[PDB]
Structure formats: structure tokens, C-alpha cells
Write an enzyme that holds these catalytic residues in place. Structure first.
Site, PDB file in Angstrom:
ATOM      1  N   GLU A   1      58.661  56.697  46.868  1.00 42.55           N
ATOM      2  CA  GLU A   1      57.809  55.776  47.712  1.00 42.55           C
ATOM      3  C   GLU A   1      57.464  54.542  46.762  1.00 42.55           C
ATOM      4  O   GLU A   1      57.794  53.354  47.181  1.00 42.55           O
ATOM      5  CB  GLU A   1      56.641  56.354  47.975  1.00 42.55           C
ATOM      6  CG  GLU A   1      56.022  55.943  49.396  1.00 42.55           C
ATOM      7  CD  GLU A   1      55.268  54.577  49.325  1.00 42.55           C
ATOM      8  OE1 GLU A   1      55.405  53.658  50.054  1.00 42.55           O
ATOM      9  OE2 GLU A   1      54.542  54.226  48.408  1.00 42.55           O
TER      10      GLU A   1
ATOM     11  N   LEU B   1      45.941  55.754  42.818  1.00 39.84           N
ATOM     12  CA  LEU B   1      46.238  56.082  44.103  1.00 39.84           C
ATOM     13  C   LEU B   1      45.464  57.222  44.574  1.00 39.84           C
ATOM     14  O   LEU B   1      45.228  58.236  43.398  1.00 39.84           O
ATOM     15  CB  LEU B   1      47.738  56.233  44.247  1.00 39.84           C
ATOM     16  CG  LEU B   1      48.318  54.766  44.250  1.00 39.84           C
ATOM     17  CD1 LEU B   1      49.764  54.972  44.672  1.00 39.84           C
ATOM     18  CD2 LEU B   1      47.597  53.471  44.929  1.00 39.84           C
TER      19      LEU B   1
HETATM   20  N1  LIG Z   1      47.868  52.449  48.325  1.00 42.81           N
HETATM   21  C1  LIG Z   1      48.267  51.155  48.157  1.00 42.81           C
HETATM   22  O1  LIG Z   1      49.194  50.657  48.852  1.00 42.81           O
HETATM   23  C2  LIG Z   1      47.384  50.457  47.411  1.00 42.81           C
HETATM   24  C3  LIG Z   1      46.422  50.887  46.494  1.00 42.81           C
HETATM   25  N2  LIG Z   1      45.335  50.098  45.829  1.00 42.81           N
HETATM   26  C4  LIG Z   1      44.370  50.625  45.126  1.00 42.81           C
HETATM   27  O2  LIG Z   1      43.068  50.101  45.732  1.00 42.81           O
HETATM   28  C5  LIG Z   1      42.312  50.019  44.617  1.00 42.81           C
HETATM   29  C6  LIG Z   1      41.873  48.493  44.341  1.00 42.81           C
HETATM   30  O3  LIG Z   1      41.670  47.604  45.316  1.00 42.81           O
HETATM   31  P1  LIG Z   1      40.412  47.102  45.831  1.00 42.81           P
HETATM   32  O4  LIG Z   1      39.356  48.069  44.775  1.00 42.81           O
HETATM   33  O5  LIG Z   1      40.438  46.606  47.000  1.00 42.81           O
HETATM   34  O6  LIG Z   1      40.379  45.811  44.603  1.00 42.81           O
HETATM   35  P2  LIG Z   1      41.020  44.288  44.558  1.00 42.81           P
HETATM   36  O7  LIG Z   1      42.278  44.592  44.035  1.00 42.81           O
HETATM   37  O8  LIG Z   1      40.984  43.683  45.990  1.00 42.81           O
HETATM   38  O9  LIG Z   1      40.400  43.506  43.474  1.00 42.81           O
HETATM   39  C7  LIG Z   1      38.914  43.164  43.953  1.00 42.81           C
HETATM   40  C8  LIG Z   1      38.607  41.971  43.088  1.00 42.81           C
HETATM   41  O10 LIG Z   1      39.621  40.876  43.071  1.00 42.81           O
HETATM   42  C9  LIG Z   1      38.995  39.648  43.279  1.00 42.81           C
HETATM   43  N3  LIG Z   1      39.496  39.300  44.724  1.00 42.81           N
HETATM   44  C10 LIG Z   1      39.931  40.024  45.691  1.00 42.81           C
HETATM   45  N4  LIG Z   1      40.181  39.208  46.796  1.00 42.81           N
HETATM   46  C11 LIG Z   1      39.858  37.860  46.563  1.00 42.81           C
HETATM   47  C12 LIG Z   1      40.164  36.767  47.035  1.00 42.81           C
HETATM   48  N5  LIG Z   1      40.581  36.818  48.227  1.00 42.81           N
HETATM   49  N6  LIG Z   1      39.729  35.525  46.259  1.00 42.81           N
HETATM   50  C13 LIG Z   1      39.540  35.669  45.041  1.00 42.81           C
HETATM   51  N7  LIG Z   1      39.251  36.856  44.248  1.00 42.81           N
HETATM   52  C14 LIG Z   1      39.592  37.857  45.169  1.00 42.81           C
HETATM   53  C15 LIG Z   1      37.861  39.932  42.690  1.00 42.81           C
HETATM   54  O11 LIG Z   1      37.768  39.412  41.552  1.00 42.81           O
HETATM   55  P3  LIG Z   1      36.384  38.641  40.900  1.00 42.81           P
HETATM   56  O12 LIG Z   1      35.505  39.609  40.987  1.00 42.81           O
HETATM   57  O13 LIG Z   1      37.104  38.299  39.613  1.00 42.81           O
HETATM   58  O14 LIG Z   1      36.455  37.467  41.830  1.00 42.81           O
HETATM   59  C16 LIG Z   1      37.380  41.321  43.470  1.00 42.81           C
HETATM   60  O15 LIG Z   1      36.436  41.521  42.632  1.00 42.81           O
HETATM   61  C17 LIG Z   1      42.920  50.740  43.248  1.00 42.81           C
HETATM   62  O16 LIG Z   1      42.207  52.114  43.592  1.00 42.81           O
HETATM   63  C18 LIG Z   1      44.323  50.800  43.604  1.00 42.81           C
HETATM   64  O17 LIG Z   1      44.866  51.698  43.096  1.00 42.81           O
HETATM   65  C19 LIG Z   1      45.712  48.605  45.969  1.00 42.81           C
HETATM   66  C20 LIG Z   1      46.783  48.208  46.653  1.00 42.81           C
HETATM   67  C21 LIG Z   1      47.403  48.768  47.329  1.00 42.81           C
HETATM   68  C1  LIG Z   2      50.639  46.994  43.789  1.00 42.92           C
HETATM   69  C2  LIG Z   2      49.573  47.838  44.868  1.00 42.92           C
HETATM   70  C3  LIG Z   2      50.443  48.601  45.929  1.00 42.92           C
HETATM   71  S1  LIG Z   2      51.195  48.138  47.178  1.00 42.92           S
HETATM   72  C4  LIG Z   2      51.744  49.416  47.629  1.00 42.92           C
HETATM   73  N1  LIG Z   2      52.871  49.724  48.409  1.00 42.92           N
HETATM   74  C5  LIG Z   2      53.466  50.993  48.772  1.00 42.92           C
HETATM   75  N2  LIG Z   2      54.280  51.055  49.897  1.00 42.92           N
HETATM   76  N3  LIG Z   2      53.145  51.928  47.750  1.00 42.92           N
HETATM   77  C6  LIG Z   2      52.131  51.904  46.921  1.00 42.92           C
HETATM   78  O1  LIG Z   2      51.910  52.647  45.980  1.00 42.92           O
HETATM   79  C7  LIG Z   2      51.726  50.459  46.751  1.00 42.92           C
HETATM   80  C8  LIG Z   2      50.989  49.927  45.796  1.00 42.92           C
HETATM   81  S2  LIG Z   2      50.258  51.141  44.356  1.00 42.92           S
HETATM   82  C9  LIG Z   2      51.358  50.952  43.335  1.00 42.92           C
HETATM   83  C10 LIG Z   2      52.754  50.408  43.707  1.00 42.92           C
HETATM   84  C11 LIG Z   2      53.647  50.301  42.613  1.00 42.92           C
HETATM   85  C12 LIG Z   2      53.448  50.357  41.243  1.00 42.92           C
HETATM   86  C13 LIG Z   2      54.607  49.960  40.191  1.00 42.92           C
HETATM   87  O2  LIG Z   2      54.203  50.475  39.052  1.00 42.92           O
HETATM   88  N4  LIG Z   2      55.768  49.736  40.859  1.00 42.92           N
HETATM   89  C14 LIG Z   2      57.048  49.372  39.773  1.00 42.92           C
HETATM   90  C15 LIG Z   2      57.991  50.550  39.812  1.00 42.92           C
HETATM   91  C16 LIG Z   2      57.309  51.924  39.475  1.00 42.92           C
HETATM   92  C17 LIG Z   2      58.155  53.002  39.039  1.00 42.92           C
HETATM   93  O3  LIG Z   2      59.333  52.820  39.024  1.00 42.92           O
HETATM   94  O4  LIG Z   2      57.836  54.187  38.851  1.00 42.92           O
HETATM   95  C18 LIG Z   2      57.657  48.209  40.244  1.00 42.92           C
HETATM   96  O5  LIG Z   2      57.413  47.636  41.486  1.00 42.92           O
HETATM   97  O6  LIG Z   2      58.483  47.461  39.320  1.00 42.92           O
HETATM   98  C19 LIG Z   2      52.271  50.779  40.909  1.00 42.92           C
HETATM   99  C20 LIG Z   2      51.152  51.024  41.689  1.00 42.92           C
END
Ligand SMILES: NC(=O)C1=CN([C@@H]2O[C@H](COP(=O)(O)OP(=O)(O)OC[C@H]3O[C@@H](n4cnc5c(N)ncnc54)[C@H](OP(=O)(O)O)[C@@H]3O)[C@@H](O)[C@H]2O)C=CC1
Ligand SMILES: CCc1sc2nc(N)[nH]c(=O)c2c1Sc1ccc(C(=O)N[C@@H](CCC(=O)O)C(=O)O)cc1
EC number: 1.5.1.3
Length: 186
Positions: free
Chosen positions: A30, A22
Site C-alpha cells: 500500500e 497510521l
Molecule cells: N491514512 C492517510 O492517508 C494519512 C494519514 N495521515 C495521518 O494523519 C495525522 C496527521 O494529520 P492531521 O492531524 O490532520 O494534521 P496535518 O497534517 O493537517 O497538520 C496540521 C497542521 O498543519 C498546518 N496546516 C494544516 N492545514 C493548513 C492550511 N490549509 N494552511 C496552513 N497550515 C495548515 C497547521 O500548522 P500550524 O499550526 O503550524 O499553522 C496545522 O496545525 C497523522 O496521524 C498521520 O499519520 C496524514 C495524511 C494521510
Molecule cells: C503522506 C501521508 C499519506 S498519503 C497516503 N496514501 C495512501 N494511499 N496510503 C498512505 O499511507 C498515505 C499516507 S501515510 C504515509 C505514506 C507514505 C509514507 C512513506 O514513507 N512513503 C515512502 C515509501 C515508504 C516505503 O517504501 O516503505 C515514499 O513515498 O517514498 C509514509 C506515510
């Protein structure tokens, strides 16, 4: 199967990730919000399903994988089987959602939560039908290398209240944030 939902935490510059984690330091309440929303089901004998890309899977610390009390599905076209600790693998979002209608899952799954990353958020957000977005607005800019797609407010309504979601400004580690719920149906 019940409702379809995305959940994300996003900075003001729409950042969601940097270097595989993150953009911001850990916000423990959160994370607890994320855990409460994604795990809690109102329907007896069911669990929620989480759908995530491969990089998102490997971004979760191993001690928290699979996300406990939830069915964990990973999207990948390169993997041949679910990663260690994961439950399911699908090759597309449409396949994943279809899988929830198979007999294996049809009566087990309540809510579906899309938890990122950017490509699956974008595809889901443009998936016709009824969808909610649970968005945490992290009210600062953070250097990021992964971003949330645009939320089209012509279709996604910001809801003026939602049970169980606090409405006031939160703050952890000197970082203020607020919770939002959006809903579309098209
Ligand atoms: N702040 C938040 O709420 C969140 C933060 N994050 C952060 O974002 C980053 C990760 O996200 P991001 O980089 O977008 O990567 P993704 O998690 O989307 O992973 C990308 C890989 O997933 C596979 N993939 C993704 N979409 C599809 C699909 N529709 N069908 C099949 N395969 C798929 C592919 O793998 P392959 O090449 O094997 O096909 C692709 O290379 C991290 O930094 C993480 O910490 C992630 C979620 C939420
Ligand atoms: C999975 C990707 C997502 S979706 C999302 N949505 C909101 N609102 N905030 C976030 O940070 C994330 C994230 S990034 C993330 C979220 C949860 C966790 C995680 O380890 N969650 C545990 C709890 C972690 C803890 O209790 O410290 C769980 O859901 O069981 C790690 C990375």
C-alpha cells in the site's frame, strides 16, 4: 501545471491517523502504491508536487523525507521556513496552488498531490474545479484520532476503471483493502 489530486488510505470508520502515525500496521505494498501514484509523471522533464500539513510531514519517517523524486511543500502558519529537508512552505492551500504558477515552478510541476491531513483534504475536496481522489479502502475498523472528511458522492463519481489501479481485493498482514478513484468537476 497538470491535474489536482488527493490520495489517502482510510479505514471503514474513516480513520486516517492515530497518535501521529497510521491506525493500521505497515502495509508495504500500500505504501508502494502511494509512492508509485505520487511520484509517476507522464510529462517529460517534470516532477509531481506533494502538498501536506505540518503534522503529516513529521509523520513520515525521516529516512523517507523529503518524499524522493517529488517536490515537497508543507503548509504551516507557525513555521518561518520549510522544515529541514522540505522544499517549500505555504500559509494556505490557495497560496500553495498559486505558487505552482510562479516562474520558479510553472514549468517544473506536472501533477499536484494533496496528501493530508484532515483540514487540507476537506478544503481541497470543496475547491471548485476538476479534482480526483485516490482512496484506499482499508476494510476493517481501526481506532483512530484523525479522520477523512466526508466524500460527497453527488459530485465525486467512483470511476469504474482506471489504468494502473488494481481492481481486486488486496491483503497484507491479514488486512484486506481495495483501491478506488473518484472524480469531480464543478
Ligand atoms: N491514512 C492517510 O492517508 C494519512 C494519514 N495521515 C495521518 O494523519 C495525522 C496527521 O494529520 P492531521 O492531524 O490532520 O494534521 P496535518 O497534517 O493537517 O497538520 C496540521 C497542521 O498543519 C498546518 N496546516 C494544516 N492545514 C493548513 C492550511 N490549509 N494552511 C496552513 N497550515 C495548515 C497547521 O500548522 P500550524 O499550526 O503550524 O499553522 C496545522 O496545525 C497523522 O496521524 C498521520 O499519520 C496524514 C495524511 C494521510
Ligand atoms: C503522506 C501521508 C499519506 S498519503 C497516503 N496514501 C495512501 N494511499 N496510503 C498512505 O499511507 C498515505 C499516507 S501515510 C504515509 C505514506 C507514505 C509514507 C512513506 O514513507 N512513503 C515512502 C515509501 C515508504 C516505503 O517504501 O516503505 C515514499 O513515498 O517514498 C509514509 C506515510
Amino acid at each position: 501545471v497538470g491535474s489536482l489530486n488527493c490520495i489517502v488510505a482510510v479505514s471503514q470508520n474513516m480513520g486516517i491517523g492515530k497518535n501521529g502515525d497510521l491506525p493500521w500496521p505497515p502495509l508495504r505494498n500500500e505504501f508502494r502504491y502511494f509512492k508509485r501514484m505520487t511520484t509517476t509523471s507522464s510529462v517529460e522533464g517534470k516532477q509531481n508536487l506533494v502538498i501536506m500539513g505540518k503534522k503529516t510531514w513529521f509523520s513520515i519517517p525521516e529516512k523517507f523525507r523529503p518524499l524522493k523524486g517529488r517536490i515537497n511543500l508543507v503548509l504551516s502558519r507557525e513555521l518561518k521556513e520549510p522544515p529541514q529537508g522540505a522544499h517549500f512552505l505555504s500559509r494556505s492551500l490557495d497560496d500553495a496552488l498559486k505558487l505552482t504558477e510562479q516562474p520558479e515552478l510553472a514549468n517544473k510541476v506536472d501533477m499536484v498531490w494533496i496528501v493530508g491531513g484532515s483540514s487540507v483534504y476537506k478544503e481541497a475536496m470543496n475547491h471548485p474545479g476538476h479534482l480526483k481522489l485516490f482512496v484506499t479502502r482499508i476494510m476493517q475498523d481501526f481506532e483512530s484520532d484523525t479522520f477523512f472528511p466526508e466524500i460527497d458522492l453527488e459530485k465525486y463519481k467512483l470511476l469504474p476503471e482506471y489504468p494502473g489501479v488494481l481492481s481486486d481485493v488486496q491483503e497484507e498482514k491479514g488486512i484486506k483493502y481495495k483501491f478506488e478513484v473518484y472524480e469531480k468537476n464543478d
